[PDB]
Structures are given as structure tokens and as C-alpha cells.
Sequence to fold (1003 residues):
Amino acid sequence: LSIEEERFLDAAEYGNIPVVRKMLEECHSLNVNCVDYMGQNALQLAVANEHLEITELLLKKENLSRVGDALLLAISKGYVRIVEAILSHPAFAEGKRLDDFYAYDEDGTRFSHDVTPIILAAHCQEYEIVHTLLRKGARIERPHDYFCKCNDCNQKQKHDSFSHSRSRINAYKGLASPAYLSLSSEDPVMTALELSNELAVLANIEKEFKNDYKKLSMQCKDFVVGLLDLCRNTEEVEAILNGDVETLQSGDHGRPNLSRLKLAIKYEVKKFVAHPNCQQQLLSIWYENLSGLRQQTMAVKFLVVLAVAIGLPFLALIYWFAPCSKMGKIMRGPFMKFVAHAASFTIFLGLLVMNAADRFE
Amino acid sequence: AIAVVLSFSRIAYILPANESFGPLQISLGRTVKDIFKFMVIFIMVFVAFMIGMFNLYSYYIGAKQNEAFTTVEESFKTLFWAIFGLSEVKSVVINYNHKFIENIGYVLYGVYNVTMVIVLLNMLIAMINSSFQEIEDDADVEWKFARAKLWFSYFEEGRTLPVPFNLVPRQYQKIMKRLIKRYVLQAQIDKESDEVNEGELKEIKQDISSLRYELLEEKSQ
Amino acid sequence: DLCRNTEEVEAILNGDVETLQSGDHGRPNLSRLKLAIKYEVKKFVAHPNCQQQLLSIWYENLSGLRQQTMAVKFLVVLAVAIGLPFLALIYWFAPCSKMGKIMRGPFMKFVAHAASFTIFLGLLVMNAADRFEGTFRMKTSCFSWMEMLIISWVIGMIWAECKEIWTQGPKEYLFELWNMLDFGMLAIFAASFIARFMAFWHASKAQSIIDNVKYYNLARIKWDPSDPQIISEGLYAIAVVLSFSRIAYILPANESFGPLQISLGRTVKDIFKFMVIFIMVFVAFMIGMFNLYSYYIGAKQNEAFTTVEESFKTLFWAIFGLSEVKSVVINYNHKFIENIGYVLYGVYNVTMVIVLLNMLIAMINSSFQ
Amino acid sequence: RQYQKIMKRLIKRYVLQAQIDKESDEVNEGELKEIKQDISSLRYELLEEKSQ
Ligand SMILES: CC(C)CCC[C@@H](C)[C@H]1CC[C@H]2[C@@H]3CC=C4C[C@@H](OC(=O)CCC(=O)O)CC[C@]4(C)[C@H]3CC[C@]12C
Ligand SMILES: CC(C)CCC[C@@H](C)[C@H]1CC[C@H]2[C@@H]3CC=C4C[C@@H](OC(=O)CCC(=O)O)CC[C@]4(C)[C@H]3CC[C@]12C
Ligand SMILES: CC(C)CCC[C@@H](C)[C@H]1CC[C@H]2[C@@H]3CC=C4C[C@@H](OC(=O)CCC(=O)O)CC[C@]4(C)[C@H]3CC[C@]12C
Ligand SMILES: CC(C)CCC[C@@H](C)[C@H]1CC[C@H]2[C@@H]3CC=C4C[C@@H](OC(=O)CCC(=O)O)CC[C@]4(C)[C@H]3CC[C@]12C
Ligand SMILES: CC(C)CCC[C@@H](C)[C@H]1CC[C@H]2[C@@H]3CC=C4C[C@@H](OC(=O)CCC(=O)O)CC[C@]4(C)[C@H]3CC[C@]12C
Ligand SMILES: C[C@@H]1C[C@H](C)CN(C(=O)c2csc(Nc3ccc4c(c3)OCO4)n2)C1
Ligand SMILES: C[C@@H]1C[C@H](C)CN(C(=O)c2csc(Nc3ccc4c(c3)OCO4)n2)C1
Ligand SMILES: [Ca+2]
Ligand SMILES: [Ca+2]
Ligand SMILES: [Ca+2]
Ligand SMILES: [Ca+2]
Ligand SMILES: [Zn+2]
Fold:
């Protein structure tokens, strides 16, 4: 293997900085792009074993191949310092972000050909790298609808029809990553809910990729739930659960504009609503005027239901004559409405029972 | 009578509100889909045996001691009540001398009972247990969501009267920035809360290797 | 799992497309998939990469039919059942056509066979149309048009099986549950038809003669116990039961009830393993009870434990609770044997209903996990 | 030929993925010890060089 080249690769792989530096300075005939038994050159080995000084020394060398693959490998393994060092290479002067540039050998690429550095960083959930790439304008392309009929999508479908679905699912996996959701959009909760809804919709259409799309929607739901979990005071809780209280008008005289909660229920998040932070607000809304009735026992509430069943005609009579009153405002409470409907159903069942009073015995 | 039965069936609407019987009702309800899925095959086997027994005993309308397998309706009724053990064995005996058809009916009825009471019912029990395991895995959260839906059904300002008497007539941007920063920090900590794996440890071994090479080179000079 | 584009997927699933010739006008030479199925890999085929190719092969010309709902496919099956004679007529006259090429698709073949089976089941149901609501041997023995259609269907099924056993070989064709049950059902159907034909032959000879003729004019109340008509009716009933048992062949295709059927079927082996011991204990108690009550043939209130057949029947129906307790009482003064029988019957019930059945339930749960 | 190229590519990819999945295993006592002995040998070498 041209024992000089084998020694150079051996030094590069195991961080022998002085030997690789002396060879880069004094050889003048060493093949820099020579590969080992696995087709990995010095740069790929140095990136793989996380050697920063060797990486910088090789980057200063020109005509160095496998630089895009080196960046991709560094991103996939974290290595934030190495990623930043590679990004300073002239090939990435804000122009190569998001062919044959990312190939790791003569034939093929290390990852899927559609996986750009931003998509790979989102997949691996490297917050520093995702933030860096976003600052450099890297964006995931938000693939088109499943039934899109445009020329580009049609050509992609008729060409391979299997790389197309894989590219679509990779783009969605990048979009649905918590890191990209948190660092990309200005309204991460709303965007996460919308993306979860879209992925849930697409889960039914594609039978083969049903598990993957459901998993991505679950990731979006997990992001929303975790974002809710970190709230500490009622202001943050309202911001997460309700949204922008300035642009959104008040739901009622004292309601917190539950529009986003309705949207979350419609999207079957199932855990952004069941969270205790949402549970306390929902309970507070449930008992608007019955502040002291919350601490009563179950028997007390059963007695209240029976009393409402007894006095339902009186409540109906006083509702029309007095719209606003000490009792009238209480009756408008959601819990009082539920109790009234339940008591009405109890009265109906009692009427059904007593309709056959002539033959009980 | 049927409407009274359905009205009392409607009583389960408000039971999710109670904490004592809400999650229990949700857990029982999540099994009904699997029960229906099994009942499809149950009805298939039922139709099989019903048509077989009806074709066997169609001619002996008067020879039979009872009218169990004379008509399609009677065969359906007899095989349905055989599930609960309310159908006797005398529904196979024939007053005529022919023991061939009587023993064929005995064998078919025994096979039906073995398939239904022993095999199918036990497999239904196993299916219900297997479903109820994963149902219990997430019972609390599902009950919470159901109760939230029940609350949101009443949060609207539209209906106030019951069924009787019904007939008559910026800062937000700051908070989001703060919460996103907090989430980034917490996600990084939770990632740090993962177990070390071979690759991670190797990256450290290569550090020491490069450090050794640098130090030995400096010592040589 | 590592394949990314369709070229790699074909290379892994099919092999060398150059050395291997094309399977058909557009088939990917599924020889390696056949080898993988024969070797019971069970996961190289169930992988989504293989699943997408198999689905694409499944719908060759029905590109738009994949996105239809289950109700739409059921309607398609019903329409194919209605139009099967038209499809058969157009297959011979036009080998290649817009509809003819569609009919050659594997999914269309499966739908056609399923619809044919639905037609056969409907014929079986409607063969007894004379007594759905409720209810001279020459008239009885003659065949009807429905009977002739059923006979033709049975002959077609038998010939199809014969073709399969010829194209697979004795051993290959045999070791298969569907093949084993389809042979039994067809044999019983053929036996019923042969018995009916023998009865018709005797009736035809009696009518040709126009003593030896008085017997064939007797009513059903005075028929011979070994009459071919009775045997034919019993065999026909059992064959109908087996034909409806055959309906589970196409249920694996459905996603709703496929995995459920497979899961239930995987328990049958353990059920049989337990039933062996169940039958052992059953034989134990049956022989004990038969030896106990053999002598009191007339003293007993009923004939429950008088003979081996009666003891077997009583103990079998005791499993489902359909056997009473009066089968132990004896009209004689001897309470020793009566109480011995009471104790033995109680021990049998405790062993079967309580112990063995609950242990069977536990075994089924452990397997189903 | 084309099939040989595809097989070579897929085998290389499988080797890389298998190595990564092996790296995805938990560190165990033996593995960590091999690292401790590195530091030990490095310390001996450095102290010897300091002594000279
Ligand atoms: C009283 C007995 C003899 C007959 C009962 C028949 C009905 C009158 C029962 C059946 C179901 C009962 C209802 C089911 C449960 C509830 C929820 C309960 O509210 C709670 O569970 C407390 C927690 C909360 O309100 O948030 C109020 C009573 C109510 C409507 C019950 C009222 C009485 C009902 C209608
Ligand atoms: C699993 C399947 C596909 C195998 C085929 C099953 C049949 C060939 C078996 C099953 C039940 C058997 C029947 C059950 C018991 C009897 C009782 C027996 O009736 C008599 O005693 C004859 C009348 C007389 O006593 O004179 C006649 C044989 C017969 C019908 C048997 C004939 C053979 C049958 C139909
Ligand atoms: C896969 C298929 C093609 C197998 C077919 C097998 C049949 C050709 C054989 C097997 C069992 C035979 C049957 C066994 C029993 C009878 C009962 C027999 O009727 C009687 O018992 C009358 C006796 C009497 O009158 O005394 C009529 C012939 C038949 C149908 C036999 C006809 C020929 C059968 C159907
Ligand atoms: C209609 C009811 C009242 C009586 C039903 C009796 C038969 C006519 C049923 C019983 C089982 C049914 C079959 C079982 C399931 C299927 C598979 C089904 O195909 C699918 O599951 C869709 C997915 C796919 O085809 O790949 C097509 C209908 C079919 C043959 C069904 C056709 C109608 C069958 C034969
Ligand atoms: C676990 C095994 C190996 C232990 C042995 C069991 C037998 C020795 C036991 C079990 C049931 C017992 C029998 C059950 C009850 C009775 C009823 C009893 O009948 C009478 O009342 C006598 C008649 C009269 O009243 O004058 C006679 C004893 C006897 C047969 C018992 C005798 C002793 C038996 C056979
Ligand atoms: C999944 C569970 C299954 C059970 C039905 C109990 N389940 C309740 O929660 C429940 C409590 S009272 C009631 N009402 C009712 C009355 C008559 C009924 C009926 C329901 O179904 C058929 O006939 N249902 C749900
Ligand atoms: C493992 C499961 C056990 C059950 C039998 C249901 N199983 C089906 O999947 C099924 C649906 S219809 C049908 N046909 C049928 C009819 C009469 C039958 C019989 C089978 O076995 C004995 O008598 N079998 C398989
Ligand atoms: Ca780790
Ligand atoms: Ca390093
Ligand atoms: Ca076959
Ligand atoms: Ca390890
Ligand atoms: Zn497009």
C-alpha cells in the first residue's frame, strides 16, 4: 500500500500530529487522497476519530477531496469544533448549504443523497450545529403534498419512486426534530402542532410509512408537551396554552381564549391537554363561581345534583326573569350546566321508572 | 321498551366525569373494538354451524322431539342459546330408528360446543387480556383527555337550559424566547443524561493518544 | 434494510438481473423471494422494502384501486361475483384486451376465486330454499338445477386440486392444512353425491319395472335405517360445515382480521397438546363410571352410565354443564354405590370444569403473550 | 458489472453501519480499564522523560 502512504494514514487515524505535519511539509510526493482498506482518506479518518489539529492541517492543504463527506460525518457524530473548522473551508462559503460533492468514495454517498447538512443535523439533534447552519441560512425544504402533480415531483416519481418517498420521509424527519422546531420558527408550539397534524394526515395515505409518520407526529407531540412542561409561572403557562393574548381577543368576560386548546384537542395531542399545567387551568375554568365547591366530598356533590334536580323548574323560571344575578351568574358556569343536564336526565329516568307505577307490586 | 333500554344505555355519557368510574369506563370501552373484531369470526363460525345443522335436520320436522333445528330461525336460536348453556342436548334425538343422522348431529353439536364454549371463548378472554394490558399502560392520560373533551363540550356559551324548558326560546415574544432558551438547555441536559456507549468512550481514548504523541514529540525536541 | 433506491432493492430482493432471465413481461424474477419463503426467513419478506415491491406486483393494472376503501373493494368483489360468467366468456374469445389484461392480474385472480367461493356458499344456502320459513321416492331422489350446479362446483374443485397435486407432487401438496382440509371436504361431498346417485339408481330401476316395488313407495317414517338417502344427507351436512370452514382461507388477506386469525391459529397447537391430557383424564373417569354403573341397567333413572357410549356422552356433556346430577341416583336401596358415584362425579367435575379448564385458560394466555 | 458494483457498495455500507451499531453499545468495565492503562503508560513515559 505504498508504505509511505500506509504510514501517513496510520499517523492520521491515531492523531500523530507531528508525523502528519512533517509529511505535509517535506514529502512533496505523498498522495494526500490515498485511502485505507475501507476507502477512507486521511481527512475522513481524522474527522471520524475526532482529531482537530489534523483536521485543520488537512483543510489548509488544497486539492483535498472528500470535504463535503467530511462535514457530513462530523455533523453526524457531533464534533462541533470540527464542524466549525470544516465550515470555514472555501467550499462552504455560504454557497453549498442545503453534484457529487458529498460522495464519500467513487460510487455512492455515506447517507441518503437528499440528506443535506441541515437535514442531517436536525436528524441527529445537534442543537449547536443546527443553530449554526440556521444562522447560515440552511433551511429544510418542506416537501410538497403527497398528491402533488408539478413537473419536478412528477419527474422524481417516474424516475425512481422509491428514492422519492425516502427523501420525503427524511425531510419530514428533519422538520419534526425538536431541535429544528425550537430553533427555526418564531412560534415553535403552533408550528409543531401544525406539523403533527400534517404528519398524522400523511400517516393514513402511505401504508408502508405509517409507522414512521406516526412516530414523527409523536415526536412533534412530545416537543409540545415538553415545551409545556417547563413553564414556571402562570404567564408562561398562558403563553404556551393560549398563545398571543394581544393579537387574540378575549374568549369571554374572563376566558383565556381556549382556541389553541380546541386546536390541540382536534389534533388528538392527548398529552398537551392531560398535562397538570393544562389540567389546573381547565379545572379553574370548570369552576368559575363555585370556588368553595371544589373541596366538597363526592356525597356533597351528589346532594347538590339532587337539589338541582328538585329545583330545576325554579332555575328555569329565574333564568328568564333575571339574566344576571347572584344565582343567575352561578347557573351560567360550565359545571352548573353539566349538573343541570345530569339532573334533568335523572328526572327523565325517574319519569321512565314511575310511568309503570300501576304494576310495581 | 327498546327505547327505555337505549335511554338507560345513554346514562354512561356523564360517568367519565367521575374520577372513580371514568378511567374504568374508558378502559372497558377500549376493548369493544377488539370484541367486535373477534365477534366477526365468531359470527362466521356460527353461520357455518347454523347452516350445517339446518341442512341436517330440515326434513325431520315432525320426527324431532322439539323444533330446535327445523327452520333457519330455530337453528339460529338454538345455536345462539347453546353459547350460554341454555340449550339442552335432547335437541339432537330423533324419534325415528335412523341413528346415522342422530349421531351425525351429536358429533356436529359436540364440535360446535367445543369450538365455541372452550376454544373461541378462551381465545376471546386471552385477546381481551392482551388488549387490556396496553390499555392499562396509558389509562390515566386517556381518561384525562376524555374528561377534557367532556368539559369542552360544556365550555360553550350556547346551551344553558337543560332538556326541560328548552322548547321555549412584545411580551409574548419575550416569553417565547425565554421558554425556547430554557427548552434548549433542558434538552441538552437530558441528552447528557444518556448512557455512555463505546463510540463515545473511544473518542476519549483517541484524545489521550493524540496528547501522548504531542507530548512525546515535544520531549524528543 | 440499508437499500436506498429501487436499484439496490432489486439487487437484494431479486439478485443478478443479467444472469437471471425475466420472470414475465414485467416481473422482477421472484426466484430469490421464493427461495426466501421456502427457507422461512419470515423477516426478509415482511420488511417494508420487500413489502412495497410485493404490493406493486400485487396490483399490476389496478393502479387506482389501491387507494379505494374496504367497502369499495367489497363492492368490487360482489360485482365480480355477479359478472363471473361474462369474464369467463370474454377470456376465451379475447385473450388480450383492456379487461382481459386486467383479469390476468393476481389481485383480480384472488377476487375472482373469492367471488366464486361466495357464489358456491350462496348456492349451498339457497339449496334449502323450500324450508327457510318452514315446511314416491322417484321425486325425492332426482336432482335439481341447484343440485347440479353444486355438483359441477364440487367436480371443478376436485379437478383443481388434482392439478395442484400434479404440479406440486405428493409430499409438497400434502403437508399443507388447506390441502388437507380441502381433500376431506371434497371426499365427503363426493360420498354424499354417490349415495344420492345410488338411491336415484334404485328408484329408477323400480320405476322402470312398474313385491319388490312396495318398499320404494314407503314414507320416510318407514324407511330403512341404512338407506343411502340418510347417509347422503348426513354427509352433505358435514360437507357443508367443512365448506364453511374453508372460508378462512381468504381472511388472511384482510388487514382487519388477518393478524387476529393468525394469532388465534397459533394457539391451536397448544390447545391440542392440552386436549391430549384432557382426553386421558376423560378416558379415566369414563371407564371408572362405566365399571361402576354397568350392572344397574334398569335400576338407574336414566341410561347415563349404562354403556360405554352413554358414559362417554354423559361425561362429555358434563363439561358444558348440560348433564344433570340425577344421573347418579339409583332406585335401589344401596346407597354405597350411589355415594361412590356422587364422589366420583364431583371429583370429575372439579378436575374438568375448575382445574383443567382454568389451566387451559392460563396456557392460552401464556402462549398468546 | 452493475450487480457486482451494487453488491460492493451495499457490503461497504453494511460494514460501516455494523461498526456504528457496535459503537452504539454500552461501555463496560473492561473497555474503561483499557483506557486507564493508557493513562498509566502515558504517565510512566512522561515521568521518565522528565527524569532525563
Ligand atoms: C341514586 C341511585 C340510587 C340511583 C342513581 C341513578 C342516577 C340518578 C345516577 C346514575 C349515574 C349518576 C351520575 C354519574 C356521575 C356523576 C358525576 C358527579 O360529578 C363528580 O363525579 C364529581 C367530580 C366533578 O364533578 O368534577 C356528579 C353526579 C353524577 C352526575 C351522577 C348523578 C346521579 C346519576 C345520574
Ligand atoms: C376431519 C374430517 C374431514 C374427517 C371426516 C369425518 C367423517 C368421515 C366422520 C366424522 C364423524 C363420523 C360419524 C360419527 C358417528 C357415526 C355414527 C354411526 O351411526 C350408526 O351407528 C349406524 C346405524 C346403526 O347402528 O345401524 C355411523 C357412522 C358415523 C355417521 C360416522 C361416520 C364418519 C364420520 C362422519
Ligand atoms: C377424493 C374423492 C374422489 C374420494 C372419493 C371416495 C369414494 C369413491 C368412496 C370412499 C367412501 C365410499 C362410500 C362409503 C359408504 C357408502 C355408503 C353406501 O350406502 C350404504 O351403506 C348402503 C348399504 C346397504 O344398502 O345395505 C353407498 C356407497 C358409499 C357412498 C361409498 C361410495 C364410494 C365412496 C364414496
Ligand atoms: C356480505 C355478508 C352478509 C356475508 C359475507 C359472507 C361472504 C360473502 C364473505 C365472508 C368472508 C368475505 C371475504 C373475506 C375478506 C376478503 C378480502 C378482501 O380484500 C381486502 O381485505 C382488502 C385488502 C386487499 O384486497 O389487499 C376482499 C373481500 C373478501 C374476499 C371477502 C369477500 C366476502 C366474503 C367471502
Ligand atoms: C385419595 C384416595 C386414594 C383415598 C381413598 C378414598 C376412599 C377410601 C374413600 C373416598 C370416597 C369414600 C366413600 C364416599 C362415601 C361413602 C358413602 C357411604 O355410603 C353409606 O352411607 C353406607 C350405606 C348406609 O347408609 O347404610 C359408604 C362409605 C363411602 C363409600 C366412602 C368409602 C371411602 C371412600 C371410598
Ligand atoms: C365498555 C362497557 C361495556 C358495558 C356496556 C358497560 N359500559 C358502561 O360504561 C356502562 C355503564 S351503564 C351503561 N349502559 C348500558 C346499558 C345497557 C346496555 C349497554 C350499556 O350496552 C348494551 O346494553 N354502560 C361500557
Ligand atoms: C384458530 C381459529 C379457531 C376458530 C375455528 C376460528 N378461526 C377462524 O379464523 C375461522 C373463521 S370462520 C372459520 N370457519 C370455521 C367454521 C366451522 C368450524 C371451524 C372453522 O373450526 C371448527 O368448526 N374459521 C380460526
Ligand atoms: Ca450516548
Ligand atoms: Ca480529539
Ligand atoms: Ca387447494
Ligand atoms: Ca461494550
Ligand atoms: Zn411538486
About this structure: The pocket of zinc ion (ligand 12) is lined by residues A 144, 148, 150, 152-153 (CB under 6 Å). The first helix of chain A runs from residue 3 to 13.
